[PDB]
A paper describes a structure:
Interactions between a T cell receptor (TCR) and a peptide-major histocompatibility complex (pMHC) ligand are typically mediated by noncovalent bonds. To assess effects of these Cys substitutions on the TCR-pMHC interface, we solved four high-resolution crystal structures.
Overlay of the 6218 TCR-PA/H2-Db, 6218 TCR-PA4C/H2-Db and 6218αC TCR-PA4C/H2-Db complexes revealed similar binding modes. Tetramers of H2-Db loaded with PA or PA4C bound to cells expressing the 6218 or 6218αC TCR, but not to cells expressing the 6218βC TCR.
Residue numbers in the entry:
A (entry chain E): 1 to 31, 39 to 61, 66 to 72, 74 to 81, 83 to 253
B (entry chain D): 3 to 6, 8 to 33, 39 to 59, 66 to 70, 78 to 84, 84A, 84B, 84C, ...
C (entry chain B): 0 to 99
D (entry chain C): 1 to 10
E (entry chain A): 1 to 176, 181 to 277
The structure:
C-alpha cells in the first residue's frame, strides 16, 4: 500500500542535455521530496513540495527545478546536465508520520558516450572437488567490461527468478584500478545442492540488465551502439 | 543534531544496541530511526517522543531526560545490516537532516566451517577460470591481491534458507599464466587448514 | 455550514457627559462568517478614525469584534453604528442612546 | 507560547 | 490559584491568493496578551498586554515563525476540507482552532484543550484524556483516522502537559488580579406615574456577572430588561438591568451585583432627594 515509484533505475545523459526524473505515489500524500546522495555522503534535500505548486528549496537546490501540478507526482528537472550531477536521486512522500522513499534513480552525466560499454557475461560451473567435498555446488557469474556502473544481475532457475542461495558483490571491481573511467567487473554466486546440480533437467541462467543508450540518443561511433539490453549466460545441470 | 558511533559489528542472532546522543533536543522533537542498505531507498524503522516504543522491526528506549536514546534490535538477521540514522524531527516539520548514521555489520554464524579454495571452469570456454574461496568462518576478511592483474572480490554471504545454511565466499580471477588458486588468496589471513584440492 | 447574523450594541466606554472626552463603541458579536463591515456614524456621516479589536470567537464558534473611536458627546450630536454582513439583505443601523 | 500544529493536516 | 492560557485561531481560505486570512489571539486568564494578524503591513506576533513587552527579541521571532508555519498548516488543511466536502462552493471557508490549558493552585494540568470548527460547526476535538478524538461528521472521521494513524494526539498532549503549562507560569510571574464592579442606579421617565430604574455594573473583569432587582429581600414578579455583557474597550466589561417602578416608590427597590472579585455581593438603590 505505502509505495513510492521511480523509473528508470539508471540513466545515462550527455553533458548539457535536459533531464526529467519522475516520482509517483498513488496514496495522494500532500508532501513530496527530492534528495540526492553521492557515494560516501548522506542524503541531501534538493526540494520539498508541501502541496501542488507549493515548493520550497532544500539544502542543495542549485542546478534543479521541480514541478508538482498534481499530488500523485513530483518531477525533478535538470535544464542542462553537469557531470557533477552524477548521483543517485531519491524521491520520498509523507502524510505526516514517516517518509516513504522511492527505489532511486542512478544518473550518470558524461561529456561523451565513447567509454560506454555493455557487460560480457560468463557462467563458471561448479568444481567436482566442491561437489565431492561438500555435497554442494557453486555457480559463479562474472559480468565484465561494462561502463558506467549501470547493471542489475539476477539468477533464474527453471525460468524462475531466485534470491535464495545467491550473493552478488555489493560493489563492482575496476578492471584498471588506476583509471577514473575504468570499466567494471561484478561477480555473483548461486549455490545449490550437488543433487540439484546433477539433474540434467535443471536450467540455470545468469541475467544482466545493462542500462545504456536510448533510441533518441545519437551515436556517431563506429562500434556497436551500447544500448539498454539484457546479456545472459546459461548452463544445465549434469550427472558427471 | 544527533551523534552516533560510526560503526557497530555483530553476529546474527545476538541483540544489537545502537546508541544516539541528542542533548539539545526540544520538547516538540521526535526521535526517528531510518535505515539504508547501500544504494537502496532508506526505510523508516521506528520513532518515539518519550520513553519506550515497540514495533515488529525494533525497540526504542528514550532516557527520562530525553538527551539520549537506543535502538535495540533483538536476534539480528543478516537482512538488518545497514546504515542506521537517528534523526530529530520537529513535530510540526516535514524536513529531516540525515547525518552520518551508524554502519551496522552483521556476520553470519557459520556452524560447520570447511574453508576451501576451488577452481571453476567457464561453461563455454575451456581456457577461462575463476578461484572460489568459500566456507570460511566470519572472522576472516579477504584482502585485494598484491598483483594489479589479479581481481579479488570482497567476501559475500549467501543464505540457503531451505537448509539452515549460510556460507561466506570471495572470488579471484586473472589473465596472467603465473596465477593459480593455490596463490590466489596469499595476501589474505586464511585458515591454516584451508582445503586446496590437488590438481 | 452555519451562518449567524451579528447582534449589535452601541454605547460609550464611560457614562456619557456632554463636553467630556469618551469612546463610542459598536460591539458586534454572535456572527459567522467573520467577514463584516462596520461603520461608526456622526450625524449620518462616516467617522474616519475607527479602530477595532482583534478577531476572536465564543464557545459556539461565533465571532465578536469591538469597533471604537474617541468622541466628545454633546446634547444634540447623534451617533450610530452601521453593519453589513452576508446574512443581511441590507445594512443594519443601530442608534446610540446614552442611557442604554 | 503558541502551539504549532502536528505536521499531519486535516 | 487557578489560571488559564488559550489561543483562538481563525483561518479563512483565499486559495486564489498566496495565503489564507489568518489571525491568532492569545489569552491569559481570559485577557488578551498577544496576537498575530495576516491583515497587518508586516505580519508578526505582537504584545497586547504591557507585561509581555519584557520578553526579548528571540521570543517574538520564534512566535512569528510558528505563525508562518500555522498559516501553511491552515492553507493545506483548507484545501483538504474543500475535497472532503466535494468542492461545495463558498467565499468564506473557515477553519477555527482553540487550544490551551488550565493550571491549578498545585501547578498541575487541570485540563488540556484542542478543538476545531469548520464552517461554524464543531469538526474534530481532542477528548479530555488527550488521547482520543471526537469527530462531528463523515469528513471529520477521515481526519480522525489519519491522526490516529500518525499519532497526532501525542504531539498535542506533549504541548499541553509541557510548554503550555511552563509558559503560563512565566507569564503569571511577568504579569505579577480581578477588577470588582462599581455600580450605580440611574432614573428615567417611562409612563405617567412610572419610572425606569437602571442598575449599571461598570469596570469589572472577568465578564461573568449577575444583576438582580429585589424589593425588601424578595424577587420582583416583572421580568428585568437587561443587556448582554459587553466590553468597555479598556479590558473591563459593562452590564445593566432595569425595572419599571411607581414614581415615589424608587427607594424601596434594591439592585444586587454578584461578581467573583467581590468579597460579598453589592447592594444599592436609587436615593431620592
Ligand atoms: Na504510501
Ligand atoms: Na532436481
Ligand atoms: Na520535554
Ligand atoms: Na512513551
Amino acid at each position: 500500500d505505502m509505495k513510492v515509484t521511480q523509473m528508470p533505475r539508471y540513466l545515462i545523459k550527455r553533458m548539457g542535455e535536459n533531464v526529467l526524473l519522475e516520482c509517483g505515489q498513488d496514496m495522494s500524500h500532500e508532501t513530496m521530496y527530492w534528495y540526492r546522495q553521492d557515494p560516501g555522503l548522506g542524503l541531501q534535500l534538493i526540494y520539498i513540495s508541501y502541496d501542488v505548486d507549493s515548493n520550497s528549496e532544500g539544502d542543495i537546490p542549485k542546478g534543479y527545478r521541480v514541478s508538482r501540478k498534481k499530488r500523485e507526482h513530483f518531477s525533478l528537472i535538470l535544464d542542462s546536465a553537469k557531470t557533477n550531477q552524477t548521483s543517485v536521486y531519491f524521491c520520498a512522500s509523507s502524510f505526516g508520520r514517516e517518509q516513504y522513499f522511492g527505489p532511486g534513480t542512478r544518473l550518470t552525466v558524461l561529456e561523451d558516450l565513447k567509454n560506454v560499454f555493455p557487460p560480457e557475461v560468463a557462467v563458471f560451473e561448479p568444481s567436482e572437488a566442491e561437489i565431492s567435498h561438500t555435497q554442494k555446488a557453486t555457480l559463479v557469474c562474472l559480468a565484465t567490461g561494462f561502463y558506467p556502473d549501470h547493471v542489475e544481475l539476477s539468477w533464474w532457475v527453471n525460468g524462475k527468478e531466485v534470491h535464495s542461495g545467491v550473493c552478488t558483490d555489493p560493489q563492482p571491481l575496476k578492471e584498471q584500478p588506476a583509471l577514473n573511467d575504468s570499466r567494471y567487473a561484478l561477480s555473483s554466486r548461486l549455490r545449490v545442492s550437488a543433487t540439484f546440480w546433477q539433474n540434467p533437467r535443471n536450467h540455470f541462467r545468469c541475467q544482466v540488465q545493462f542500462y545504456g543508450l536510448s533510441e533518441n540518443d545519437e551515436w556517431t561511433q563506429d562500434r556497436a551502439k551500447p544500448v539498454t539490453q539484457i546479456v545472459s549466460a546459461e548452463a544445465w545441470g549434469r550427472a558427471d | 543534531k544527533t551523534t552516533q558511533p560510526d560503526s557497530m559489528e555483530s553476529t546474527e542472532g545476538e541483540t544489537v544496541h545502537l546508541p544516539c546522543s541528542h542533548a539539545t533536543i526540544s520538547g516538540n522533537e521526535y526521535i526517528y530511526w531510518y535505515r539504508q542498505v547501500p544504494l537502496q531507498g532508506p526505510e523508516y524503522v521506528t520513532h518515539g517522543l518519550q520513553q519506550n516504543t515497540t514495533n515488529s522491526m525494533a525497540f526504542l528506549a528514550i532516557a527520562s531526560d530525553r538527551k539520549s536514546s537506543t535502538l535495540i534490535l533483538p536476534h539480528v538477521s543478516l537482512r538488518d545490516a545497514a546504515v542506521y540514522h537517528c534523526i530529530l524531527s520537529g513535530g510540526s516539520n516535514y524536513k529531516l537532516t540525515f547525518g552520518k548514521g551508524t554502519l551496522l555489520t552483521v556476520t553470519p554464524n557459520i556452524q560447520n566451517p570447511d574453508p576451501a579454495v576451488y577452481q571453476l571452469r567457464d561453461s563455454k570456454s575451456s581456457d577461462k577460470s575463476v578461484c572460489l574461496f568459500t566456507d570460511f568462518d566470519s572472522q576472516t576478511n579477504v584482502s585485494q591481491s598484491k598483483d594489479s592483474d589479479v581481481y579479488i572480490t570482497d567476501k559475500c554471504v549467501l543464505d540457503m534458507r531451505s537448509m539452515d545454511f549460510k556460507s561466506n565466499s570471495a572470488v579471484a580471477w586473472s589473465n596472467k599464466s603465473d596465477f593459480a588458486c593455490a596463490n590466489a588468496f596469499n595476501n589474505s589471513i586464511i585458515p591454516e587448514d584451508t582445503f586446496f584440492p590437488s590438481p | 455550514m452555519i451562518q449567524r447574523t451579528p447582534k449589535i450594541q452601541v454605547y460609550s466606554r464611560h457614562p456619557a457627559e456632554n463636553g467630556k472626552s469618551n469612546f463610542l463603541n459598536c460591539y458586534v458579536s454572535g456572527f459567522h462568517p467573520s467577514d463584516i463591515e462596520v461603520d461608526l456614524l456622526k450625524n449620518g456621516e462616516r467617522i474616519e478614525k475607527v479602530e477595532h479589536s482583534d478577531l476572536s470567537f465564543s464557545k459556539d464558534w461565533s465571532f465578536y469584534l469591538l469597533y471604537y473611536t474617541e468622541f466628545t458627546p454633546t446634547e444634540k450630536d447623534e451617533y450610530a453604528c452601521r453593519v453589513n454582513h452576508v446574512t443581511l439583505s441590507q445594512p443594519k443601523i443601530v442608534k446610540w442612546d446614552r442611557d442604554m | 507560547s503558541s502551539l504549532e500544529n502536528f505536521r499531519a493536516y486535516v | 490559584g487557578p489560571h488559564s492560557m488559550r489561543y483562538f485561531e481563525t483561518a479563512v481560505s483565499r486559495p486564489g491568493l498566496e495565503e489564507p486570512r489568518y489571525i491568532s489571539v492569545g489569552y491569559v486568564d481570559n485577557k488578551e496578551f498577544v496576537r498575530f494578524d495576516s491583515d497587518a503591513e508586516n505580519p508578526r506576533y505582537e504584545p497586547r498586554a504591557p507585561w509581555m513587552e519584557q520578553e526579548g527579541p528571540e521570543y517574538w521571532e520564534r512566535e512569528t515563525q510558528k505563525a508562518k508555519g500555522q498559516e501553511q498548516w491552515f492553507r493545506v488543511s483548507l484545501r483538504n476540507l474543500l475535497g472532503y466536502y466535494n468542492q461545495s462552493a463558498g467565499g468564506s471557508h473557515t477553519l477555527q482552532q482553540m487550544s490551551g490549558c488550565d493550571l491549578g493552585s498545585d501547578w498541575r494540568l487541570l485540563r488540556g484543550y484542542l478543538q476545531f470548527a469548520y464552517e461554524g460547526r464543531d469538526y474534530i476535538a481532542l477528548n479530555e484524556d488527550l488521547k482520543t478524538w471526537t469527530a462531528a461528521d463523515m469528513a471529520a472521521q477521515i481526519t480522525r483516522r489519519k491522526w490516529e494513524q500518525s499519532g497526532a494526539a501525542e504531539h498535542y498532549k506533549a504541548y499541553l502537559e509541557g510548554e503550555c503549562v511552563e509558559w503560563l507560569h512565566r507569564y503569571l510571574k511577568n504579569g505579577n488580579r480581578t477588577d470588582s464592579p462599581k455600580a450605580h442606579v440611574t432614573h428615567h421617565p417611562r409612563s405617567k406615574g412610572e419610572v425606569t430604574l437602571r442598575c449599571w455594573a461598570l469596570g469589572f473583569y472577568p465578564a461573568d456577572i449577575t444583576l438582580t432587582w429585589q424589593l425588601n429581600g424578595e424577587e420582583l414578579t416583572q421580568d428585568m430588561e437587561l443587556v448582554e455583557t459587553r466590553p468597555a474597550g479598556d479590558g473591563t466589561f459593562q452590564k445593566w438591568a432595569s425595572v419599571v417602578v411607581p414614581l415615589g416608590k424608587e427607594q424601596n427597590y434594591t439592585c444586587r451585583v454578584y461578581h467573583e472579585g467581590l468579597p460579598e455581593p453589592l447592594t444599592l438603590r436609587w436615593e431620592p432627594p
